[PDB]
RNA sequence: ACGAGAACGCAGCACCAGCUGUCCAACCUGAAGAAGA
């Protein structure tokens, strides 16, 4: 609807674990983390909070576009209705982005395994080895993992019904970076809003099988719905609470296991926003709002 | 309230030691002060 285009200009380090490595992407919870601590920065915490929690401001999470080809991490579809051709096996499996206009194409069948992945080339992975210098103890040699994107390649996040404030946050992130090593030299980019056309009839289709598009935990009431007839993945999302005003100490939070952006369901949940920090003195939350991509297998 | 924050790939270290721009080689060859002053 809303493809959020970030252009980096620096390597940038999305951990997943630890500083030894890098992932491509980050996460809507860490978009979200993000944006709420721009908007502690500037104020109005409380009205992002509001806007984000009322379904006003709902967003996927960041995946790669490379020339104007927009792309989607390979859903989890059951693959019951592809035995009788092509290869139903690992040839499907380092495929890890599929584009997002030849999804119903992929559904369908006959997209090529082995030409995606060469044709899927946004830079590399880099080490960066660092150190901590002591004046006369020994140097602390560390690496940190980082990524550096290509040319005319970046990272778009699907934004419903975009708003002022969020507009007014996303500004504010430019100058603050967005990762791992953001105050070092690595989160730097940025960002258009890019209203596109091709892509919001992706997203006003209709179909049986449902895309999940953002890290997502379904709320108590609908676990049972959302847990039927669903290809989904789990993933721990903690870490350690980013801000010095928490509970005086570097303390971790409480981690969350929510559905993976690749997970597929027959059933439209709504996720929530959950509080991951409670014995702090302001309320840690862990964005896991569902967005979806409705598909016809 | 971004698997986070904080962290110099940094400190010591002579592009240096030995080595004739030397050896051989002729500034050499060929050439009248006459003639009617």
Same mark, same amino acid.
């Given at each position: 609807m809303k493809i959020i285009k970030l252009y980096f200009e620096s390597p940038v380090h999305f951990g997943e674990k630890r500083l030894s490595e890098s992932k491509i992407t980050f996460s809507a919870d860490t978009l979200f983390s993000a944006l709420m601590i721009e908007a502690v920065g500037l104020g109005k915490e409380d009205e992002f909070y509001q806007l984000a929690s009322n379904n006003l401001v709902k967003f996927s999470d960041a995946f790669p576009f490379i020339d104007q080809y927009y792309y989607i991490p390979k859903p989890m579809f059951n693959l019951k209705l592809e035995k009788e051709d092509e290869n139903p096996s690992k040839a499907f499996k380092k495929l890890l982005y599929v584009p997002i206009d030849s999804l119903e194409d992929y559904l369908s069948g006959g997209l090529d395994a082995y030409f995606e992945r060469e044709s899927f080339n946004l830079g590399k992975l880099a080490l960066s080895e660092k150190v901590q210098q002591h004046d006369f103890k020994d140097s602390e040699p560390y690496n940190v993992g980082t990524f550096t994107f290509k040319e005319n390649t970046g990272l778009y996040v699907l934004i419903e019904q975009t708003h002022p404030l969020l507009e007014e946050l996303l500004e504010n992130l430019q100058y603050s970076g967005? $990762? $791992?090593?953001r105050n070092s030299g690595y989160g730097k980019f940025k960002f258009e809003i890019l209203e596109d056309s091709d892509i919001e009839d992706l997203f006003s289709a209709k179909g049986n099988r449902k895309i999940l598009l953002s890290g997502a935990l379904p709320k108590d009431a609908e676990l049972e719905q959302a847990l039927k007839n669903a290809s989904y993945l789990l993933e721990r999302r903690g870490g350690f609470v980013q801000s010095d005003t928490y509970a005086t100490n570097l303390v971790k939070k409480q981690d969350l296991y929510v559905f993976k952006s690749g997970s597929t369901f027959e059933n439209s949940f709504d996720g929530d926003i959950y509080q991951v920090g409670k014995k702090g003195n302001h309320p840690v939350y862990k964005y896991a709002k569902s967005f979806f991509l409705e598909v016809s297998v």
């Open positions: 967005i $990762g $791992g090593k």
